[PDB]
Design a protein around this ligand. Sequence first.
Ligand SMILES: COc1c(OCc2ccc(F)cc2)cc2oc3cc4c(c(OC/C=C\C(=O)O)c3c(=O)c2c1CC=C(C)C)C=CC(C)(C)O4
Ligand SMILES: [Mg+2]
Ligand SMILES: [Zn+2]
Length: 325
Amino acid sequence: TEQEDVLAKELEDVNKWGLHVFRIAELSGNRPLTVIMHTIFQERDLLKTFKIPVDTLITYLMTLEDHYHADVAYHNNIHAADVVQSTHVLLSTPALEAVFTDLEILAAIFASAIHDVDHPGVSNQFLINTNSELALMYNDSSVLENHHLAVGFKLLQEENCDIFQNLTKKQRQSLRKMVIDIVLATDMSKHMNLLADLKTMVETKKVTSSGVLLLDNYSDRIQVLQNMVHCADLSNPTKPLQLYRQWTDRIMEEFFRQGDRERERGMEISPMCDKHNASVEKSQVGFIDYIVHPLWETWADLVHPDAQDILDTLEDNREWYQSTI
Ligand SMILES: COc1c(OCc2ccc(F)cc2)cc2oc3cc4c(c(OC/C=C\C(=O)O)c3c(=O)c2c1CC=C(C)C)C=CC(C)(C)O4
Ligand SMILES: [Mg+2]
Ligand SMILES: [Zn+2]
């Protein structure tokens, strides 16, 4: 059709920060995760490298996409698609050229795709406070993030879904470990510790003779990939404003809906979740000043100057939201 050529044209931007991911969700028939993952796998030659049969890739991607909730405004398949594509661009940065194996690239991108699957649109703390089945199963520790990993790996077992069927045993074992390490690190309560280790690596940075970042050991390697996917997760305020604003609209609907459940249950309402006492603009500014900018400023230092434009957009968007109060 012609509609698929409009999508093919939009998928030419897959290597650019600020891809119009909502448009790709429209043109793909609510399949952004599938088409962006497929496009990225092609672009990085991962199907040939890992002997992934193309029909197995599509079947798994669609089943994965299916297990994101379409009735959750933020933590859905579009967010998933966005984090995948943002990680993809972050992998491409000059300061990281030829740093990561094809297996590590594969783990980072797969982790990003599964990283929020079957998110119910409420927080870990809500799930703990309400004595949810999820919290009971995972003993109040990385409750959502454990669940995303369990669902993401378990779907590889569905008919014609094992996109890793042609990896060696040791490649599967290494990848499984790296993916778990990555997604468990997206637990928001780990951000401070994650950023502290990132600062320390920035303060003791070492580059090779090609001016490219030097990582001697699994600990440093996995930690860079953990922060990379965490940054991609918290990248909405680094995007062009017309994108950023829709992500704000979507997170506040989710947060407001959680607050209405907290309120009905007699609970104290979570930060930013009270629709009767909200301050969306001041919260975005606060969230950038205390969380997103300290994080992205540190990442920008790690890959300096590759990330300068991304950080400038972040600063402009913070200025814009500030100007509305
Ligand atoms: C309880 O702690 C807080 C928090 O406290 C209140 C607060 C207020 C002002 C402050 F300055 C400091 C704290 C405020 C938060 O505000 C948010 C706003 C967001 C997005 C968020 O989701 C994370 C992104 C991806 C994903 O969840 O998948 C959050 C949070 O998760 C979040 C958290 C937890 C996250 C930590 C790192 C600690 C996503 C999209 C956009 C960018 C549009 O706006
Ligand atoms: Mg998450
Ligand atoms: Zn996320």
